[PDB]
């Protein structure tokens, strides 16, 4: 009875729409105002998703809040690369059904480097034959992959939680009938996971810079995302809060 995995499938957010006006010709300000608003909408779903994850109440409430804010970008990216793989086979970026980026939009957004990388990623879901159940567990582990150098309020409990999510991914790995095939798979998946973090880093750096000059470029930030960018994000960019990398 795959209890952990039933839960992940049970709690998985459904489709979220950006509200972008696709009938207007593409502008940078409107594309990014629509991404910012999509970000907030996806955030609301991530909070409800996270709070219903196995063990999550083990966490101190402040840690609960902190890891959601820190991991948000990496989660969005990961799920987006999967959405782009499943729906359109990596030919475009399926940010949402009403906000799909072709290469013209990738360039018009001014995050082309990041967009092409998220396209690398989307294609790896196919190349590595990632199963839906590998995706779900991987996405969960991602929520517990970014910690502060000064420590959480209860670091022991987070460390127990991460260990056990890694356990679950081990069990998922295990077709089974070969430890060496299990390791090869483990290597590949953890490498895929690690590669989400530089992308989120580039994306964080870009949105930081975009907020700071947003009045200059008529890009609107919702209240909440402006707080997160200005309050949590710089902790990541300043090196106070760091991804946990499997490799080096």
């Amino acid at each position: 009875q795959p209890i952990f995995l039933n839960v992940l499938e049970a709690i998985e957010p459904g489709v979220v729409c950006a509200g972008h006006d696709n009938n207007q010709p593409d502008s940078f300000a409107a594309l990014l105002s629509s991404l910012n608003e999509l970000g907030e909408r996806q955030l609301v779903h991530v909070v409800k998703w996270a709070k219903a994850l196995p063990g999550f109440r083990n966490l101190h409430v402040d840690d609960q809040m902190a890891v959601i804010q820190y991991s948000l970008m990496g989660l969005m990216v990961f799920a987006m690369g999967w959405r782009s793989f499943t729906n359109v086979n990596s030919a475009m970026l399926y940010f949402a059904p009403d906000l799909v980026f072709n290469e013209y939009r990738m360039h018009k957004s001014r995050m082309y480097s990041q967009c092409v990388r998220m396209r690398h990623l989307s294609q790896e879901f196919g190349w590595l034959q990632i199963t839906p159940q590998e995706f779900l567990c991987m996405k969960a582990l991602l929520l517990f992959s970014i910690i502060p150098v000064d420590g959480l309020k209860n670091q022991k409990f987070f460390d127990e939680l991460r260990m056990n999510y890694i356990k679950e991914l081990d069990r998922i790995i295990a077709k089974r009938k070969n430890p060496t095939s299990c390791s090869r798979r483990f290597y590949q998946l953890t490498k895929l996971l690690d590669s989400v973090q530089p992308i989120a880093r580039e994306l964080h750096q870009f949105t930081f810079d975009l907020l700071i000059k947003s009045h200059m470029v008529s890009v609107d930030f919702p209240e909440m995302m402006a707080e997160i960018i200005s309050v949590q994000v710089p902790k990541i960019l300043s090196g106070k809060v760091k991804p946990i990398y499997f490799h080096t």
Binding site: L43, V44, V47, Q64, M65, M224, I228
Partner: peptide, 11 residues
């Protein structure tokens, strides 16, 4: 700060 706390405390 309070905007994300409030979301988190609410839905």
């Amino acid at each position: 700060d309070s905007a994300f706390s409030r979301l988190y405390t609410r839905s």
